[PDB]
């Protein structure tokens, strides 16, 4: 009925467009799906994109001179708003072109047709709320373990388990398993469900609440959780929806040990640096070896043909000496995911998984730690379970 | 390079 | 007769090793050619890297416990020394291996037979020298115009013309030509030669001199300058040789126009910013267009189907109005090379080169309809336009 | 996209 004309500061405009671009980084085959939709009414501007799998929308205050909507190239609008100086941006739709003016610069972009542009999905009912930073961090942590190979679709997702008081997030690529448990404010106390969500850009979607206290997870309420086949994530004028994966996740809980025959605690920053150093002589970046004993661990890599490397690091160790080897990338991935100063390793044999957990202040000590063991596992809200690789012998 | 003993999965 | 053992701080070691190892071959004919040669004697450590094209040699102070030499993998030594803590590094050769120790970290690397390592070429006699900052600026200004296509080897060079106290530097890729003239301290007043030096290598050396001592260029003296087919570059305890290109360079001077039908002076920073903006819609066209007339220029790009952009900019203009188009990257490369607040454009037609030269903010280069003579300058960037649409 | 009139070169 009327043509859209609005006006707002560049930083706000750019940040809204950025939200959509970060949540939809790839370029779909269907051209119209590359469009961003601008809608102005009353005192607000909504900026959105959709590709049938992920939708993303930001809402910002704006001076709406004339209400309406327009579809324009997402790529161009992103490039332009990122490059502009911090001045007011005028946008005026006229015919099948949109005029975008900022200071002395004038752009005139072709409009795209909304005839076959899909309607954005509706957010399901709120399922619960989490602290904004905590959730964004939790997703970032576990996502490092997700598979990235579509030939095994079940591994490309982050498992999300809802249980009234808690949310559990899990991801695995068959070589590491990351599991995070968070407490939250659930709308329904008796709720129980589990879904599988594509991991590839879930870390970006997880930042929706940043700027505010909480982020809202929307999967539906009561019995019909997961029914819509979408996960909504929103907060602070930003939202997204992500189509769920209809694939079965491995049963991972049986893998989490409840006791260890050896336990080692050490400094994360030191260990990461030493791994990166000794791995410089590892061929194919295949393997680093760790010889744990009382008071110290020898980290080593290499062979007599290209070169050998080793470094001794202080460790607070319990049990019998153990030699165990790891993929150094998987190992530093785990260490970096801990987001803590110190790491505790829980071991059994050189051929069985190693359990990495962050060391906290409120951790209750392992009783009989100085004795023989087996040593009971310490309660933790994050674990990174890592398979070792076989030693050459 | 063994996998985690996921069942199924390995 | 003895095995090498030395000690020195990681940072000193890493910086020397890195500089020497970088010009080692991508696909070494034999394992020996991937190596860097360490030689310790008296109070000093020499680090040598041979390559057919470019050979490099750094000298640093070191604690020499026992003199000798050893050949070890260049890339691995570089990576290791870059990653170590800022502690002393102990290096000890035993038989066929070299132990490198730093704090709690220990490396044991295989060595290679030093007898099989090619001798590094001797540097030619010194030809002249110049301040490091001048060398860095002049080379940076000219190298941006050099070709990067090895199917046309002559264009991958920087032409270096020496006549006494004066040095002229030139490069082109057929679309832009950059020429810098400078003064230096010549070894002999009557020295005179012209050579062609691989640009990529020279550019790296000029950047690495930044902050450093005067830079010495060694091509020889008198009539024999250039005869060795080598350029030596030295300073800061580092010396390298670069094999010269044995290829004819185009006669570029005849391209420099001596008069213009229009002349335009603009603010460099503002024009560079405006080009960056309007070029956002020019991915397909790879051009920006400029419509000059008195007082103002319309800078624009794009097309109806992909999107359009325009900005009007202030210009001090004289002569015939002109519509002309440029590759925006080649244009901002030239503007970035001027190192001045303002730019003078010297034009003839929309299908002929534009002469860009530096203008200070305190200068104002007019009466009549034209033509206007070209103003003498120590730097030019001559840029071919592209055809306008339609 | 014409070249500079270099001789030779164009
Ligand atoms: Ca996209
Ligand atoms: Ca103890
Ligand atoms: Ca014990
Ligand atoms: Ca434990
Ligand atoms: Ca737990
Ligand atoms: Ca001149
Ligand atoms: Na905003
Ligand atoms: Na929308
Ligand atoms: Na915050
Ligand atoms: Na450290
Ligand atoms: Na690796
Ligand atoms: Na202990
Ligand atoms: Na290496
Ligand atoms: Na050897
Ligand atoms: Na050099
Ligand atoms: Na050289
Ligand atoms: Na672009
Ligand atoms: Na001129």
In this structure, are strands C185-186 and C192-198 parallel, antiparallel, or unpaired? unpaired
- CA angle A3/A7/A13 to nearest 5° reads 110
Cα–Cα distance measured from residue C32 to residue C54, given in angstroms and rounded to the nearest whole number: 16
How remote is the CA of residue A259 from the centroid of ligand 11, in Å? 29
First to last CA, chain A: 77
Among C224, C235, C168, which residue's Cα sits nearest to residue C196? C168
Q: For chain C, which chains pass the contact test of at least 3 CB pairs under 8 Å?
A: A, D
Query: Which residues of B fall within a CB distance of 8 Å from A174?
Result: 3-4, 6, 9-10
Quick one: which ligand is closest to A253's CA? 5
Cα–Cα distance measured from residue C377 to residue C258, given in angstroms and rounded to the nearest whole number: 12
* Sequence-separated (6 or more) residues with CB below 8 Å from residue C72: C35, C36, C38, C98, C109, C110, C111, C112
How many C-beta atoms surround the C-beta of residue C253 within 10 A?
A: 11
Among C382, A310, C365, which residue's Cα sits nearest to residue D9? C382
How remote is the CA of residue C241 from the centroid of ligand 16, in Å? 3
Cα–Cα distance measured from residue A354 to residue A308, given in angstroms and rounded to the nearest whole number: 25
Considering only the beta carbons, identify the residue of B4, B7, B8 that sits closest to A172: B4
How remote is the CA of residue D10 from the centroid of ligand 12, in Å? 76
Domain boundaries, chain C: 1-124, 125-255, 256-390
Cα–Cα distance measured from residue A45 to residue A348, given in angstroms and rounded to the nearest whole number: 57
Place of tokens 């610069």: A105
Considering only the beta carbons, identify the residue of C174, C386, C387 that sits closest to D4: C174
Tokens in use for C106? 């220990």
CB C35 within 8 A of CB C71: yes
* Strand-pair partners of C70: C38
- Residues written for chain D: 10
* Strand-pair partners of A216: A129, A234
Q: Give the orientation angle of helix C74-83 with respect to helix A268-278, to 10 degrees.
A: 170
* Sequence-separated (6 or more) residues with CB below 8 Å from residue C88: C7, C8, C9, C10, C102
* Strand-pair partners of A178: A171, A384
Cα C373 → chain centroid: 31
To the nearest whole angstrom, how far is the Cα of C78 from the nearest Cα of chain A?
A: 11
Tokens in use for A143? 């996502």
Among A60, A64, A61, A58, which residue's Cα sits nearest to residue A42? A64
CB pairs under 8 A between C and D: 39
Q: What is the DSSP string of A164-213?
A: SSEEEEEEE-SSEEEEEEEE-EES-TT--EEEEEE-TTHHHHTTTTBTBS
* Strand-pair partners of A190: none
Cα–Cα distance measured from residue A114 to residue C106, given in angstroms and rounded to the nearest whole number: 65
Cα–Cα distance measured from residue A16 to residue A45, given in angstroms and rounded to the nearest whole number: 9
Query: Which residues of A fall within a CB distance of 8 Å from C278?
Result: 105
Query: Which residues of D fall within a CB distance of 8 Å from C251?
Result: 6-7
Instruction: Provide the phi-psi class of A96: left if phi over 0, else alpha when psi is between -120 and 50, else beta.
Output: alpha
Considering only the beta carbons, identify the residue of C172, C351, C387 that sits closest to D6: C172
Query: Which residues of C fall within a CB distance of 8 Å from A312?
Result: 104
As its CATH architecture, domain A256-393 has: Roll (3.10)
| Helix residue ranges, H only, chain C | 10-21, 74-83, 132-143, 199-209, 268-278, 328-337
* Sequence-separated (6 or more) residues with CB below 8 Å from residue C206: C135, C136, C138, C139, C140, C143
CB A59 within 8 A of CB A73: no
User: DSSP letter at C298?
Assistant: E
Fold assignment, A125-255: DNA Polymerase III; Chain A, domain 2 (3.10.150)
Q: What is the DSSP string of A208-232?
A: TTBTBSEEEEES-STT-SSTTSEEE
The SS3 assignment for C236 reads coil
Superfamily of structural domain C256-390:
DNA Polymerase III, subunit A, domain 2 (3.10.150.10)
Quick one: which ligand is closest to A366's CA? 4
CB pairs under 8 A between A and B: 39
**Contact call for A105 and C79, based on CB within 8 A:** no
How remote is the CA of residue A73 from the centroid of ligand 17, in Å? 13
Tokens in use for C49? 């890297």
* Sequence-separated (6 or more) residues with CB below 8 Å from residue A365: none
Residues of chain A contacting B, Cβ within 8 Å: 155, 172, 174-177, 250-252, 254-255, 327, 351, 353, 385, 387-390
How far is the CA of A137 from the CAs of A127, A130, A194, in angstroms? Answer: 20, 11, 20
CB A208 within 8 A of CB A188: no
How far is the CA of B2 from the CAs of A240, A287, A328, B9, C286, in angstroms? Answer: 38, 13, 15, 11, 52
Quick one: which ligand is closest to A210's CA? 9
* Strand-pair partners of A135: none
User: DSSP letter at A74?
Assistant: H
**Contact call for A389 and B1, based on CB within 8 A:** yes
How remote is the CA of residue C372 from the centroid of ligand 18, in Å? 8
Enclosing H/E stretch for C69:
strand C68-73
| Helix residue ranges, H only, C234-295 | 268-278
* Beta-carbon-side half-sphere exposure of residue A214 (alpha carbons within 13 Å): 11
Q: What is the DSSP string of A82-149?
A: HHS-SSEEEEEEETTEEEEEETTEEEEEE----TTPPPPPPPPPEEEEEEHHHHHHHHHHHHTTS---
Resolution (A): 1.9
Q: What is the DSSP string of A294-327?
A: TTEEEEEEEETTTEEEEEEEE-EEESS-EEEEE-
Topology agreement, domain A125-255 and domain A256-393: yes
Cα–Cα distance measured from residue C251 to residue C236, given in angstroms and rounded to the nearest whole number: 35
- Helix and strand counts by DSSP (H, E) for chain B: 0, 0
How remote is the CA of residue C246 from the centroid of ligand 14, in Å? 37
Cα C125 → chain centroid: 22
User: DSSP letter at C153?
Assistant: G
**CATH classification for the domain delimited by C1-124, as one of 3.10.150.10, 3.30.300.30, 2.30.130.40, 3.40.50.720:** 3.10.150.10
Classify each residue of C72-89 as buried b or exposed e, where b means 16 or more C-beta atoms within 10 Å of its C-beta: bbbebbbbbbebbeeeeb
Residues of chain C contacting A, Cβ within 8 Å: 73, 76, 79-80, 83-84, 104-110, 274, 276-278, 280-281, 304-313
| C and A adjacent (3 or more CB pairs under 8 angstroms) | yes
To the nearest whole angstrom, how far is the Cα of A277 from the nearest Cα of chain C?
A: 6
**Contact call for B7 and A353, based on CB within 8 A:** no
Q: Which residue of A has its CA nearest to C103?
A: A311
CB A342 within 8 A of CB A310: no
């Amino acid at each position: 009925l009327t043509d859209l004309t609005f006006r707002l500061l560049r930083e706000s405009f750019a940040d809204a467009v950025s939200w959509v671009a970060k949540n939809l980084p790839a370029r779909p085959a269907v051209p119209v799906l590359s469009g961003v939709l601008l809608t102005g009414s009353d005192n607000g501007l909504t900026i959105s994109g959709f590709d049938y799998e992920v939708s993303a929308e930001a809402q910002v205050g704006a001076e709406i001179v004339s209400p309406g909507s327009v579809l324009v190239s997402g790529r161009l609008l992103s490039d332009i708003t990122r490059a502009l100086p911090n001045k007011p941006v005028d946008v005026h739709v006229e015919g099948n072109r949109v005029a975008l003016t900022c200071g002395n610069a004038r752009f005139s972009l072709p409009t795209m047709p909304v005839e076959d542009y899909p309607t954005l999905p509706t957010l399901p009912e709120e399922t619960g709320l989490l602290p904004a930073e905590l959730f964004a961090e939790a997703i970032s942590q576990v996502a490092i373990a997700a598979g990235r190979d579509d030939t095994l679709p079940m591994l490309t997702g982050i498992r999300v388990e809802i249980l009234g008081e808690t949310v559990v997030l899990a991801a695995t690529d068959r070589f590491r398993l990351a599991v995070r448990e968070l407490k939250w404010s659930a709308s329904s106390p008796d709720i129980e469900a589990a879904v599988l969500v594509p991991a590839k850009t879930l870390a970006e979607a997880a930042k929706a609440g940043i700027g505010g206290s909480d982020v809202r997870l929307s999967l539906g309420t009561g019995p019909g959780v997961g029914k819509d086949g979408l996960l909504g994530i929103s907060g602070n004028g930003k939202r997204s929806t992500t189509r769920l994966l209809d694939a079965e996740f491995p049963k991972f809980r049986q893998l989490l040990p409840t006791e260890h025959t050896a336990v080692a605690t050490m400094d994360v920053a030191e260990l990461i640096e030493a791994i990166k150093l000794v791995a410089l002589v590892a061929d194919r970046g295949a393997q680093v070896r760790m010889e744990f004993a009382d008071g110290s661990v020898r980290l080593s890599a290499g062979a007599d043909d290209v070169g050998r490397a080793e470094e001794d690091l202080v460790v607070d160790y319990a049990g019998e000496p153990l030699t165990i080897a790891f993929n150094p990338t998987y190992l530093t991935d785990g260490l970096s995911s801990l987001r803590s100063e110190r790491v505790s390793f829980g071991f059994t044999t050189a051929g069985k998984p190693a359990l990495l957990r962050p060391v906290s202040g409120d951790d209750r000590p392992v009783a009989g730690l100085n004795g023989n063991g087996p040593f009971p596992a310490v309660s933790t809200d994050y674990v990174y379970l890592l398979m070792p690789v076989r030693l050459p012998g | 390079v063994p996998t985690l003993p996921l069942v199924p999965x390995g």
